[PDB]
């Protein structure tokens, strides 16, 4: 049935720069049929935010830096000078048909300068071996851009296969990133095995960093 | 004070039936129209529903034909979601929304969501664990220190440190499914290396889905 | 653009009758566009009221002998035991546009037993001769069918294009109707001759009804 | 206690300027959105504009853009079509109307209509003559009287009956157009014979478009 068609699908942009989404009707429409487009911002762990209604009127409290244009079957959302508060997933959304449909989605990324993680290791508690279990954790703060690697070493054995990671969403104030990378291990592993590093590789680290603890030590 | 709030949203095994409830405060829902929309995890919006209670007239995506019915209770002004036969496509979060004033077609007000988790395992609470501080580990000229909260489930968790006492350099990451199926995370915050072993971090870690609260006082090892 | 289509654009039925009404829209449609169809009733001097919304809703205050049902792109206004007092033209009107249109609407008239006319003649005032016109009129009251013949005479010469008439709605109560006749003469036309006349043939007379005055009688 | 009612109509000259008002009661115009709709003499109902007061927010038919202008006044819980440039085609009862409740789509309140005639012609008052039957004239009992009114521009007239108290028997006859270019309409009723030249029967007839009043008292000669 009738949808529409979201692009670009993501983008990465500076501060003050324009940037243009664009939301097209997947066919034709008979003329003289309203779709009464809206647009949406989305943040992490928020609802969305109405931003533009029936097109191109601006919603109340919204900056006006948002605009939204439409011709035919093809419809714009427009932020004229992008702020670090923009970093948000964009929608759109046609009412041609009952239900009305969502685009897909936009996520804008703000592009900043540089910045390399300030970066820390865990050891595991003593609370937690008591289960049979060891947690290492490694913390990359407040870096850009957010392509980061992160390799383990147990007694300079890599460590392959036993770790997750998670990544923050964009810092709305200062467009960084943070990232962990957990090492899971048996007690019995665990106490078998000195020292534990973690080596972080970034585009802002000139060489790799490595962080470092000798498990009984302090 | 234009509110709304669902509630009523968490975990229930495939083919069960859950109520949803969506309380709106600052406007009465007989004036208006009442929408669902819901969202799986690291997906787009789904429209789900929507209700002029007035007249009692419904419309549903074709997704729920059949299986959810969407009402509203005027004296009570509540919209409910009843969803029956549940399936694990249907997780996500949930969202109610209006529409204002006589201005159709956008939804300008919406609620905070709540979670709808389709699944035969059943709910745990974390284990909560320190991320010590150190004097000895300092980087970009501070001290970092945090929780780990381990094997929970379903999503989710809330960490606030110094009970919101403390909210600048924290970063309580997504969770990540472990190979168990349970949920971890942590929750990290930086600090000045003077501030060790004199000032006191407390994270305090809510998973209501188990009823689980703990307070977790994390301080260098000695 | 898309219209809708109504049928038939008149029809007669008699107290107690199902009476249906169709509105078809020009084309197709995309499937999920709502088109939100309204019925209106109006009668004589008087704005449309909604009988009828979004498709099958009965709007409040209005008799239950009204629904209306739509499938795909026909829809259907019913009144399920018609009354005297349904005597109105009905419209379709269509949202799937904007501007939305109407159907170009349905004459509905109430059919019932025949009824001979009432038949009165009315001379010119010596007022309005003093300003060089004389008119004649001829009534015709309560009556059914609508159909009628009034024929003009004076002192025996059969008046052609010189007269026009007048017809009343259908009554809302009694389903007739009445009918005048104007018959125009100059003043001096009028004062040379004797005997007006005016004869009329209705079905529900045997024969023809003849009212007539002599001039200067009074 | 809903309401709305329009004003503004009457006799323009072609290309001439008119501004209607559709003033509302019961309600807010604010919380809604007003239509204007119009019905040519004759003929179907034709949708003109729209607004949404709160934001401004118009829509028009293809007929009369760049021509009319619909807006309002919140203050005044009045709306208005301003139109210009008026063509004969316009000619038309114009109507305004409402949506209710969140009720899109649906008008549930409509004014009584306004009549908009486009025209070169000018007002003309009708001159009003009795109708009644000649002194030698027989009846079985009932007899008729009434009212010409002759020789008026624009539509409308209204006649009443003895001040509104003789509203029984009566008919008052769709007005026809007249070679010269003017109305004239009669209005009849039907009394009992016995009461002509006992009872007083007065016609009533308003010509608002010239500011003509009648009240003529009609008896046989």
């Known amino acids: 049935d009738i949808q529409m068609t979201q692009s670009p699908s993501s983008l990465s942009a500076s501060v003050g720069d324009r940037v243009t989404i664009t939301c097209?009707?997947?066919?034709?429409?008979?003329?003289?049929?309203?779709?009464?487009?809206?647009?949406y911002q989305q943040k992490p762990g928020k609802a969305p935010k109405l931003?533009?209604?029936?097109?191109?009127?601006?919603?109340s409290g919204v900056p006006s830096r948002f605009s939204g244009s439409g011709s035919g079957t093809d419809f714009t959302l427009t932020i004229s000078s992008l702020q670090p508060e923009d970093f948000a997933t964009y929608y759109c959304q046609q009412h041609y048909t009952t239900p009305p449909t969502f685009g897909q989605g936009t996520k804008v990324e703000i592009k900043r300068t540089v910045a390399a993680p300030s970066v820390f290791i865990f050891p595991p508690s003593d609370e937690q071996l008591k289960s049979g279990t060891a947690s290492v954790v490694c913390l990359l703060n407040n870096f850009y851009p957010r392509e980061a690697k992160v390799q383990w070493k147990v007694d300079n054995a890599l460590q392959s296969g036993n770790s997750q990671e998670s990544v923050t969403e964009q810092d709305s104030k200062d467009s960084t990133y943070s990232l962990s990378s957990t090492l899971t291990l048996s007690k019995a592993d665990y106490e078998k095995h000195k020292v534990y590093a973690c080596e972080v590789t970034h585009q802002g680290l000139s060489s790799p960093v490595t962080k470092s603890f000798n498990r009984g030590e302090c | 004070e234009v509110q709304l709030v669902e509630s009523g949203g968490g975990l229930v095994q495939p083919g069960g039936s859950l109520r949803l409830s969506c309380?709106?405060?600052?406007?009465?829902?007989?004036?208006?129209?009442?929408?669902?929309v819901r969202q799986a995890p690291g997906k787009g919006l789904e429209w789900?529903?929507?209700?002029?209670?007035?007249?009692?007239?419904?419309?549903?995506?074709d997704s729920v034909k059949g299986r959810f019915t969407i009402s509203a209770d005027t004296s009570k002004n509540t919209a409910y979601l009843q969803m029956n036969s549940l399936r694990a496509e249907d997780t996500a979060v949930?969202?109610?929304?209006?529409?204002?004033?006589?201005?159709?077609?956008?939804?300008?007000?919406?609620?905070?969501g709540t979670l709808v988790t389709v699944s035969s395992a059943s709910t745990k609470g974390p284990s909560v664990f320190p991320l010590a501080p150190s004097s000895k580990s300092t980087s970009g000229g501070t001290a970092a220190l945090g929780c780990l909260v381990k094997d929970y489930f379903p999503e989710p968790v809330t960490v606030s440190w110094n009970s919101g006492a403390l909210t600048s350099g924290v970063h309580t990451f997504p969770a990540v499914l472990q190979s168990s199926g349970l949920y971890s995370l942590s929750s990290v915050v930086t600090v000045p290396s003077s501030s060790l072993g004199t000032q006191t971090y407390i994270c305090n870690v809510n998973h209501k889905p188990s009823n689980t609260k703990v307070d977790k006082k994390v301080e260098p090892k000695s | 653009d898309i219209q809708m289509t109504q049928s038939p654009s008149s029809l007669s039925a008699s107290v107690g009758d199902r009476v249906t009404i169709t509105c078809r829209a020009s084309?197709?449609?995309?499937?999920?566009?709502?088109?939100?169809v309204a019925w209106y009733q109006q009668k004589p001097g008087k704005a449309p009221k909604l009988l009828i919304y979004?498709?099958?809703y009965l709007y409040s205050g209005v008799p239950s002998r009204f629904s209306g049902s739509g499938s795909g792109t026909d829809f259907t206004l019913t009144i399920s035991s018609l009354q005297p007092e349904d005597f109105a033209t009905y419209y379709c009107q269509q949202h799937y546009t904007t501007p939305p249109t109407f159907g170009q609407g349905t004459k509905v008239e109430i059919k019932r037993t025949v009824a001979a006319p009432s038949v009165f003649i009315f001379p010119p005032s010596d007022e309005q001769l003093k300003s060089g016109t004389a008119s004649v009129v001829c009534l015709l009251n309560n009556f059914y069918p609508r159909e009628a013949k009034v024929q003009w005479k004076v002192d025996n010469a059969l008046q052609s294009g010189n007269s026009q008439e007048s017809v009343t709605e259908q009554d809302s109560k009694d389903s007739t109707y009445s009918l005048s006749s104007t018959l125009t003469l100059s003043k001096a036309d009028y004062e040379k001759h004797k005997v007006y006349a005016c004869e009329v043939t209705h079905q529900g007379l045997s024969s023809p009804v003849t009212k007539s005055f002599n001039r200067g009688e009074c | 206690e809903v309401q709305l009612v329009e004003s503004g109509g009457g006799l323009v000259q072609p290309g001439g300027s008119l501004r209607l008002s559709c003033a509302a009661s019961?309600?807010?115009?604010?919380?809604?959105?007003i239509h204007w709709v119009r019905q040519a003499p004759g003929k179907g109902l034709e949708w003109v504009a729209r607004?949404?007061?709160?934001?401004?927010?118009?829509r028009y038919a293809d007929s009369v853009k760049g021509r009319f202008t619909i807006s309002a006044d919140t203050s005044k819980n009045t709306a208005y079509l301003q139109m210009n440039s008026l063509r004969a085609e316009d000619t038309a009862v114009y109507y305004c109307?409402?949506?209710?409740?969140?009720?899109?789509?649906?008008?549930?309140?409509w004014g009584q209509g306004t009549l908009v005639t486009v025209s070169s012609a000018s007002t003309k008052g009708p001159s009003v003559f009795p109708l009644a039957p000649s002194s030698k004239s027989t009846s079985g009992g009932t007899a008729a009287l009434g009212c010409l009114v002759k020789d008026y521009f624009p539509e409308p007239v209204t006649v009443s009956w003895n001040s509104g108290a003789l509203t029984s028997g009566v008919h008052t006859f769709p007005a026809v157009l007249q070679s010269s270019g003017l109305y004239s309409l009669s209005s009849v009723v039907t009394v009992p014979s016995s009461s002509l030249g006992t009872q007083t029967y007065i016609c009533n007839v308003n010509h608002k478009p010239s500011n003509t009043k009648v009240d003529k008292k009609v008896e046989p000669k």
């Open positions: 607004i949404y007061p709160t934001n401004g927010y118009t």
């Open positions: 019961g309600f807010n115009i604010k919380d809604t959105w």
């Open positions: 979004w498709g099958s």
């Open positions: 084309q197709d449609i995309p499937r999920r566009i709502s088109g939100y």
């Open positions: 109307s409402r949506w209710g409740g969140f009720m899109f789509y649906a008008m549930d309140y």
